[PDB]
From TrEMBL, chain A:
<feature type="domain" description="TIR">
    <location>
        <begin position="1"/>
        <end position="163"/>
    </location>
</feature>
<protein>
    <submittedName>
        <fullName>L6tr</fullName>
    </submittedName>
</protein>
Automatic annotation (TrEMBL), chain B:
<feature type="domain" description="TIR">
    <location>
        <begin position="1"/>
        <end position="163"/>
    </location>
</feature>
<protein>
    <submittedName>
        <fullName>L6tr</fullName>
    </submittedName>
</protein>
Length: 168, 170
């Protein structure tokens, strides 16, 4: 019933690949997991699911792909994920760097440059900054890189086992 | 006065780069840290240091560079580190992927192919395989990647802080 793990991801990048594989593995462990899909969430899920999940989950998994900063929902959620961990350092953030160099996540360079250029047309400096600070923070945490040669199912198994053993 | 952190690394690859910076940061926290350099150990240091440190340290940091598997000492030590954490999983292993794809560490491909080709001239299959299994096990753990665009002092600082939090929570 109570949520344990919170997946933050860019739908179009990973919803069918790693994110889904990780979701499946977590269920095999009966870990109650929320999928923060930036495109497919429903209106009656905001309260009963989203806020509760983000409130209850003690483990957050940002699956950060090349299109992650293109989505304002992703950035908004990462910032909130970061804030909540800072309030309650017992909470853990476990980044997955999906087919991006962690350097680009850390400095918002490469594929992320144009996202932030775009957002700066609509949002103020403090909002943009908060979003960059969250990517830097999380980009600097230990995690798993996923590259073109990885067996994503094996990584998913490693990640879910690690999560399961901690949850005890 | 026990060792707390055990650094495993390929000397010629990282001695002057990230390994030193992490050592310096750890030292700023006054964290007692052993440098398992594959070239510069002394014999009086095998007992009262190396073995003491590998025994006492509850955090192992394998800094895995492209020349890591070229060194039999590195491979041997990784296998030991991996054996010790399985024996006592309060211990943790924190891999640094220094200018290598984690993919390659995980599957011992790319730069690591020829290394294992060469060791197979002198060691039997069981021995080679135990070494491959160590790299795979460690390559599959959460850790930090370092690339050419990274500011390694920044990363050293973040690893130090993480290590420090963990030591303190105990
Ligand atoms: Co001390």
């Amino acid at each position: 019933v109570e949520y344990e793990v919170f997946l933050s991801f860019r739908g179009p990048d990973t919803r069918e690949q790693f994110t889904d594989f990780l979701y499946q593995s977590l269920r095999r462990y009966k870990i109650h997991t929320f999928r923060d899909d930036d495109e497919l969430l429903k209106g009656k899920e905001i309260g009963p699911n989203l806020l509760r999940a983000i409130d209850q989950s003690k483990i957050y998994v940002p699956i950060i792909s090349s299109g992650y900063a293109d989505s304002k929902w992703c950035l908004m959620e990462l910032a909130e994920i970061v804030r909540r961990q800072e309030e309650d350092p017992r909470r853990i953030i476990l980044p997955i760097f999906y087919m991006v160099d962690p350097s680009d996540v850390r400095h918002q360079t490469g594929c992320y440059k144009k996202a932030f250029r775009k957002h700066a047309n609509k949002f103020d400096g403090q909002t943009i900054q908060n979003w960059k600070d969250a990517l830097k923070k999380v980009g600097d945490l230990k995690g798993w890189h996923i590259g073109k040669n990885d067996k994503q199912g094996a990584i998913a198994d490693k990640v879910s086992a690690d999560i399961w053993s901690h949850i005890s």
